[PDB]
Amino acid sequence: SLRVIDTHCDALYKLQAGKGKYTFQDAEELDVNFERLIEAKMLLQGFAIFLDEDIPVEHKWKKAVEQVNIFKQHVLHKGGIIHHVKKWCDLENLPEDKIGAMLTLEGIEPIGRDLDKLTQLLDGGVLSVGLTWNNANLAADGIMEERGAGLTRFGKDIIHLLNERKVFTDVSHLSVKAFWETLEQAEFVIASHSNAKAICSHPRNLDDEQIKAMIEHDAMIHVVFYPLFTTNNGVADTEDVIRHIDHICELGGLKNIGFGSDFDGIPDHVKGLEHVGKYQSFLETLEKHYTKEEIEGFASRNFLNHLPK
Template structure:
């Protein structure tokens, strides 16, 4: 069963590797091409993530370096990897091809310059999260004690996303910023978040937040990172499925997807250690849900809820 994965951090590893890692088969990459094929991951989204300690005046260049890794290491050297820049590109993927879409995890890299964001759109970014866990000029993240909402600039970012049919990702936002996004965004999405009711982590969504996402037509993509799955002890695929079941109970059966966070995590759900193991997860899901529902989680829900083609 084909899978769409909304979040991985392979670009950070590739960029830091400065040409020493082969995207085709580097064992250091949980989402290398070989593993994506083995796991039947049909679309992989690649996040641009800038480490907080990088100086402000160097962050946009760091983002461009990761975009360069995407074009050089992922696309040019691997012809089967096809960039998705238009929402209709998902429908044009051929057998043997894997779609690759750029996303932005936090707008730190653009400072307060919307021209830089438009540049990233032109390079192919189709989903934008306003923050990582820290605060920036757009909003407070889930790790900022102040817990502020969107700034005026942050609201301008969301409006620009709307105008360009770009997703606005809520996964790392503070709760107040989340509600500001829900009010403004035409295309909200949680690219990698679980249910706070089952695992009380700041990065997870409350039931009220999840219901608001579903009511707005947004998708919630469950994340494979163990601290977001289970508070204590080893996390299993059964534990992860409990989050899916919980979101279904809130009315989201047709608005749930996957956002692995591979290459951004160093601990793993048992049996789901890299992209090659994805079908193990699918097979376990089939024991709990109807095949049509699992196909929805795997890829169809996202295709049904993506923005209309530009």
């Protein structure tokens, strides 16, 4: 078996929505739960902070802080084993009996116009920040906004702070224009959950030009287990996920590929990747296609080679 790094799940959004109905220990309805993370042999799971687009502007910060509190109270020190990775040394020094968990921020909506709110989140240990979800916000346009604009000054100022703090700038969800501008501005670039658009043409995916640029930037691309972004017909299994891995390798990105499941953030599943406990069976499926060294690259080593430094 091999340890796993997965950059993106929406367990916090789901736990929050559940209103106490879900036990993180073992709830079957949670794609990511304690028992399943153990089964996965998880090394590091990214937990996104994300609010429904319908949480009003005046409550977004409160609800985000609530998610951070859910993380601290119900995820963290689960089994004593879940260990909060708040800085990159925490991961590099992680005890072998621990499973690392980091916070990431999916769109800067919760900070309003206040950079100090972002500072608070970074101090709290957020290690990757997506400037946008799908919508227009004060930092940039996300991919679903028809205007498709790039970065605002605020967006640029945010990226500068991220660079300074050795935090990833996450391009998943950005408009095409914001993507290109972000590559010029950001020092530590990741796509925490995006697939290849040549293989599945959803606008949420990255085209060949974008993928080549990511590689040139020495960025990480973390493939996502959502059938809608995996196959054009919307029905997908693990071999279909591998077609994206193949494609990125073909574009020169063997060492730039990781996993970003989007577990708990998706209405249906890739067959064979129904929940995070399926990870080990998926890695063995990979053995028909790639060497153990290459698979270890996808599972953890690529990400580990790209920590902000």
